[PDB]
Design a protein around this ligand. Structure first.
Ligand SMILES: Nc1cc(CN(CC2CCNCC2)S(=O)(=O)c2ccc(S(=O)(=O)N(Cc3ccc(Cl)cc3)C3CCCC3)cc2)ccc1C(=O)O
Length: 145
């Protein structure tokens, strides 16, 4: 279908360039990377400091480029522990100019399991939408260090 073709064009033109996480209260950087975690079909890995689990809120900056125009770029993210969804998050970016590079700031705000239990057992599944069109699904396995 035209929508399936369109999804592939958007993916083809998309790159996640860099990204970081900060304690929202203090602004202190907890993690940063330049690996494109959005790439589908391979299991990505990331190592994050265990103190992140003590943050009431985490600020994420995500820098991306897109050759394709998007009407309503957004993300759905599911936190899975041993295959069980503990949490679902929704973030909206909105309009994306074709051939632009953009920085997107988001706030991520139950009782947390210990880092030692969680480590290597947490998968973040991220879906990349333009409105209702699914562009891609990626997975990142988290280790708490
Ligand atoms: N309920 C739980 C939720 C989590 C997930 N954490 C969310 C934090 C937990 C501490 N309070 C603030 C929210 S987290 O700190 O581990 C966290 C997870 C994902 C992310 S992320 O979605 O921003 N990102 C994944 C990501 C981001 C963007 C894209 Cl495109 C793809 C993947 C990763 C984090 C490390 C490398 C980047 C940020 C923080 C863990 C355990 C439990 C539990 O019940 O025990």
């Amino acid at each position: 279908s035209a929508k399936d073709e369109r999804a592939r064009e958007i993916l083809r033109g998309f790159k996640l360039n860099w990204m970081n996480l900060r304690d929202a209260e203090t602004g202190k950087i907890l993690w940063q990377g330049t690996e494109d975690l959005s790439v589908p079909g391979v299991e990505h890995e990331a190592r994050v400091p265990k103190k992140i689990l003590k943050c009431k809120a985490v600020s994420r900056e995500l820098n991306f480029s897109s050759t394709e125009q998007m009407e309503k770029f957004r993300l759905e993210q599911k936190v899975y522990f041993k295959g069980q969804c503990l949490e679902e998050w929704f973030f909206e970016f909105g309009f994306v100019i074709p051939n632009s590079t953009n920085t997107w700031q988001s706030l991520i705000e139950s009782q947390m399991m210990p880092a030692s239990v969680l480590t290597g057992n947490v998968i973040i599944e991220t879906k990349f939408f333009d409105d209702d069109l699914l562009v891609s699904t990626s997975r990142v396995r988290l280790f708490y260090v």
